[PDB]
Amino acid sequence: LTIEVLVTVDGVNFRTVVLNNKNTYRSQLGCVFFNGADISDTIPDEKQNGHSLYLADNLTADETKALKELYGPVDPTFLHRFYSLKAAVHGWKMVVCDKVRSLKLSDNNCYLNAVIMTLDLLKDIKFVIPALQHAFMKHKGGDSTDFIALIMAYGNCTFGAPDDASRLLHTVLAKAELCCSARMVWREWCNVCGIKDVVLQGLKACCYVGVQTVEDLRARMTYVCQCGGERHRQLVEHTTPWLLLSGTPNEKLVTTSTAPDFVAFNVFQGIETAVGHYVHARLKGGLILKFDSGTVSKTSDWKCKVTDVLFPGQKYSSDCN
Amino acid sequence: LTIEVLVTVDGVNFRTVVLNNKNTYRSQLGCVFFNGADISDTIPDEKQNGHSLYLADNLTADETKALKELYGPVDPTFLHRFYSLKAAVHGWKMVVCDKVRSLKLSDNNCYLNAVIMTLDLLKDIKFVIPALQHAFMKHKGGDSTDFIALIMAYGNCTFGAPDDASRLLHTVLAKAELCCSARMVWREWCNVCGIKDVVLQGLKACCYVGVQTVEDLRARMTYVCQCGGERHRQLVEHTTPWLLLSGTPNEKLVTTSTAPDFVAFNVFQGIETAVGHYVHARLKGGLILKFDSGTVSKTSDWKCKVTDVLFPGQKYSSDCN
Ligand SMILES: [Zn+2]
Numbered sequence: 140l141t142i143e144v145l146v147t148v149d150g151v152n153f154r155t156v157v158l159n160n161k162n163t164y165r166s167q168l169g170c171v172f173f174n175g176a177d178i179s180d181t182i183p184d185e186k187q188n189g190h191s192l193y194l195a196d197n198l199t200a201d202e203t204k205a206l207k208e209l210y211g212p213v214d215p216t217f218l219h220r221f222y223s224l225k226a227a228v229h230g231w232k233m234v235v236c237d238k239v240r241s242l243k244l245s246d247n248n249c250y251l252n253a254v255i256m257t258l259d260l261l262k263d264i265k266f267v268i269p270a271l272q273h274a275f276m277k278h279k280g281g282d283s284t285d286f287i288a289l290i291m292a293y294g295n296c297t298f299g300a301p302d303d304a305s306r307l308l309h310t311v312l313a314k315a316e317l318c319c320s321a322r323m324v325w326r327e328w329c330n331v332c333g334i335k336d337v338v339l340q341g342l343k344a345c346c347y348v349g350v351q352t353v354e355d356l357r358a359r360m361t362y363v364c365q366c367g368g369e370r371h372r373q374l375v376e377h378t379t380p381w382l383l384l385s386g387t388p389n390e391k392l393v394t395t396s397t398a399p400d401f402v403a404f405n406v407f408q409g410i411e412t413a414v415g416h417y418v419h420a421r422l423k424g425g426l427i428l429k430f431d432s433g434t435v436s437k438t439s440d441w442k443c444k445v446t447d448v449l450f451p452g453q454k455y456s457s458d459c460n
Numbered sequence: 461l462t463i464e465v466l467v468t469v470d471g472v473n474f475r476t477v478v479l480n481n482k483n484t485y486r487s488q489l490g491c492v493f494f495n496g497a498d499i500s501d502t503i504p505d506e507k508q509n510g511h512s513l514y515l516a517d518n519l520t521a522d523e524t525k526a527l528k529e530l531y532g533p534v535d536p537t538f539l540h541r542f543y544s545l546k547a548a549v550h551g552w553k554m555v556v557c558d559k560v561r562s563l564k565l566s567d568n569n570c571y572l573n574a575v576i577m578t579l580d581l582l583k584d585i586k587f588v589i590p591a592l593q594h595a596f597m598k599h600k601g602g603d604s605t606d607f608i609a610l611i612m613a614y615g616n617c618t619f620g621a622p623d624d625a626s627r628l629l630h631t632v633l634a635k636a637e638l639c640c641s642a643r644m645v646w647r648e649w650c651n652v653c654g655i656k657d658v659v660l661q662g663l664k665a666c667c668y669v670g671v672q673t674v675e676d677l678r679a680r681m682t683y684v685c686q687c688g689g690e691r692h693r694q695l696v697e698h699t700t701p702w703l704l705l706s707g708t709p710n711e712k713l714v715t716t717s718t719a720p721d722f723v724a725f726n727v728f729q730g731i732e733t734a735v736g737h738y739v740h741a742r743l744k745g746g747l748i749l750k751f752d753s754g755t756v757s758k759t760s761d762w763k764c765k766v767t768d769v770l771f772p773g774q775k776y777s778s779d780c781n
Pocket residue numbers: 329330331332333364365366367368369
């Protein structure tokens with residue numbers, strides 16, 4: 140017997156391949172996926188004539204190029220790994236408590252919940268890799284399975300295993316781009332040796348790892364100079380649409396009574412002897428809204444180990460320092 | 461009181477920082493490591509004056525640049541993640557059964573055993589990222605903790621979790637480079653539409669995912685053409701120092717009686733319902749040497765699910781096809 144199928148790697152371009160029913164899909168084409176399931180070792184099963192197949196191996200020159208333009212430069216196990224994740228995360232629930240989406244707790248995915256909910260608050264954000272954008276747009280439309288699977292694929296997350304939210308958030312942002320002007324100017328100087336300016340722009344200006352408050356970010360750093368004197372590092376200019384600050388689990392008392400400038404923050408929970416639980420939290424109304432994967436809580440004060448903290452747009456100059 | 465310390469991110473360049481005993485290391489410097497252990501939240505502990513500290517946060521312009529030149533472009537959680545792994549994999553054993561090193565079974569690291577043992581057989585291989593080379597040279601000298609920790613860091617492997625050997629092997633090789641000439645020429649053609657040649661070189665020529673035998677790699681692929689006729693894909697020229705072929709767990713009968721051309725291969729073991737066990741195997745003498753993380757076995761025949769397969773240097777032209 141003989142059947143003919145449609146073969147794609149992107150869902151846009153298709154080629155027709157004629158297959159017999161003696162050999163396996165593996166020996167005839169390569170690693171093929173049909174509606175989620177891997178069928179590489181199976182014999183072309185009669186009734187599946189004229190169906191679309193997603194290929195992962197033995198890509199043609201045209202397929203390799205289109206694969207690169209859509210996903211960017213990825214390792215050759217990326218597709219199999221991405222398709223497997225799409226099928227695995229299909230039974231995951233997004234719940235919307237008062238018009239805010241959150242990922243339900245399933246198979247240690249609370250780190251993803253923190254990643255997604257933090258990404259939702261970032262404005263003027265665009266992904267340079269086309270496949271991420273299409274999935275990002277789908278996610279914003281209510282269909283988030285592609286985005287989750289891609290984030291796990293690019294982050295090299297395995298299904299079922301716990302992971303780091305900050306780690307994943309920074310790796311995802313590396314693939315993103317800002318739609319407006321951002322500027323960050325650091326000043327390194329010595330009273331004898333002179334002045335040096337370091338300028339960052341784009342998402343580079345909007346992200347910082349080391350400090351978790353804006354007062355600490357603007358503070359002056361001092362160490363020994365080449366000349367034997369003193370060197371100083373301090374922020375001079377800062378113009379952003381928003382500011383994300385990150386650090387390791389750092390215990391802080393968070394209070395609404397002081398009216399904090401930050402909009403939201405992530406929290407690592409559980410003792411260091413048994414690690415793997417994240418919580419997203421937003422400041423809305425006069426309260427702290429705690430999002431523990433589906434469930435929602437409210438407190439005015441909270442002593443917690445904060446990791447990532449998101450601030451509004453900065454517009455600052457070092458006031459006569 | 462007041463103490464002064466040496467701060468590095470590379471072990472080469474050091475700056476002197478003067479620290480008081482009121483604040484934490486975190487608020488004064490940032491994320492600091494001393495002899496493996498994270499001490500960011502601790503108060504500068506008196507006797508640790510004039511000691512070297514490894515910093516992960518709040519890097520100076522000079523530190524950021526040197527960090528980039530040594531490790532390449534990495535996400536801002538890379539250092540903390542790398543230092544934590546160095547301390548974690550310190551109690552791992554390399555055993556040498558008849559002048560061949562293998563990584564002992566510990567915390568599901570059998571995938572690393574396969575990765576390392578396969579890398580050991582690759583000749584004329586050099587890493588473009590300086591930190592990988594220094595660790596690779598250390599590894600070859602008998603000290604492998606740095607290399608393992610780096611591979612886990614770049615592969616985004618977590619300590620204790622199982623992982624994919626092919627996945628890791630391809631991501632590691634992406635950072636490598638060949639010290640000689642390699643060439644791979646694929647020919648895509650149609651009898652009506654014409655001929656098109658696709659040329660690959662370097663490690664690109666020495667690696668292929670899709671087929672696991674050289675006969676299949678040289679075989680002709682056929683599908684429907686744009687013109688309505690037939691398109692063909694076939695390898696024409698192939699000159700390499702060695703050839704690595706990869707595929708998913710594929711059940712094969714491996715026999716020494718046929719005298720196979722391949723030197724070594726990796727095997728995925730265990731049912732798909734409970735995944736996570738790899739085995740490295742080399743053909744030496746008249747037998748198959750099975751390396752199951754420390755332990756060694758011998759058989760003449762073996763029905764197993766092969767993944768990666770390594771061949772000697774290719775020198776081939778399509779013989780009047
Ligand atoms: Zn000076």
